[PDB]
Amino acid sequence: KLLITIHDRKEFAKFEEERARAKWDTANNPLYKEATSTFTNITYRGT
């Protein structure tokens, strides 16, 4: 359901993510976080 929960992840998943994504942060998220893509305009390839 992970690909589907992405629509609700900013609200709901954002909660569970602390516990659940804690160790698997790199496994679910590419660069950093989901919100990264919405803030990255200039640099999004590294930092």
UniProtKB/Swiss-Prot annotation:
Domain remark from Swiss-Prot or TrEMBL: The VWFA domain (or beta I domain) contains three cation-binding sites: the ligand-associated metal ion-binding site (LIMBS or SyMBS), the metal ion-dependent adhesion site (MIDAS), and the adjacent MIDAS site (ADMIDAS). This domain is also part of the ligand-binding site.
UniProt short sequence motif LIR, positions renumbered to this chain: 36-42
Disease: Glanzmann thrombasthenia 2: A form of Glanzmann thrombasthenia, a disorder characterized by failure of platelet aggregation, absent or diminished clot retraction, and mucocutaneous bleeding of mild-to-moderate severity. Glanzmann thrombasthenia has been classified into clinical types I and II. In type I, platelets show absence of glycoprotein IIb-IIIa complexes at their surface and lack fibrinogen and clot retraction capability. Bleeding disorder, platelet-type, 24: An autosomal dominant disorder of platelet production characterized by congenital macrothrombocytopenia and platelet anisocytosis. Affected individuals may have no or only mildly increased bleeding tendency.
Family (UniProt): Belongs to the integrin beta chain family.
Residues where Phosphothreonine is found: T26, T38
Function of the protein: Integrin alpha-V/beta-3 (ITGAV:ITGB3) is a receptor for cytotactin, fibronectin, laminin, matrix metalloproteinase-2, osteopontin, osteomodulin, prothrombin, thrombospondin, vitronectin and von Willebrand factor. Integrin alpha-IIb/beta-3 (ITGA2B:ITGB3) is a receptor for fibronectin, fibrinogen, plasminogen, prothrombin, thrombospondin and vitronectin. Integrins alpha-IIb/beta-3 and alpha-V/beta-3 recognize the sequence R-G-D in a wide array of ligands. Integrin alpha-IIb/beta-3 recognizes the sequence H-H-L-G-G-G-A-K-Q-A-G-D-V in fibrinogen gamma chain.
Organism: Homo sapiens
Name recorded for this polypeptide: Integrin beta-3
Post-translational modification: Phosphorylated on tyrosine residues in response to thrombin-induced platelet aggregation. Probably involved in outside-in signaling. A peptide (AA 740-762) is capable of binding GRB2 only when both Tyr-32 and Tyr-44 are phosphorylated. Phosphorylation of Thr-38 inhibits SHC binding.
Subunit comment: Heterodimer of an alpha and a beta subunit. Beta-3 (ITGB3) associates with either alpha-IIb (ITGA2B) or alpha-V (ITGAV). Isoform Beta-3C interacts with FLNB. Interacts with COMP. Interacts with PDIA6 following platelet stimulation. Interacts with SYK; upon activation by ITGB3 promotes platelet adhesion. Interacts with MYO10. Interacts with DAB2. Interacts with FERMT2. Interacts with EMP2; regulates the levels of the heterodimer ITGA5:ITGB3 integrin expression on the plasma membrane. Integrin ITGAV:ITGB3 interacts with FBLN5 (via N-terminus). ITGAV:ITGB3 interacts with CCN3.
Note: The constitutive activation of ITGAV:ITGB3 on neoplastic cells may contribute to tumor growth and metastatic potential.
Distribution of this protein across tissues and organs: Isoform beta-3A and isoform beta-3C are widely expressed. Isoform beta-3A is specifically expressed in osteoblast cells; isoform beta-3C is specifically expressed in prostate and testis.
Modification type Phosphotyrosine: residues: Y32, Y44
Result for mutant: Y32A: No effect on cell surface location but impairs interaction with TNS3 and PEAK1
Subcellular localization(s) per the UniProt record: Cell membrane; Cell projection, Lamellipodium membrane; Cell junction, Focal adhesion; Postsynaptic cell membrane
Outcome reported for the amino acid change (mutating Y44A): No effect on cell surface location but impairs interaction with TNS3 and PEAK1
Cytoplasmic side: 1-47
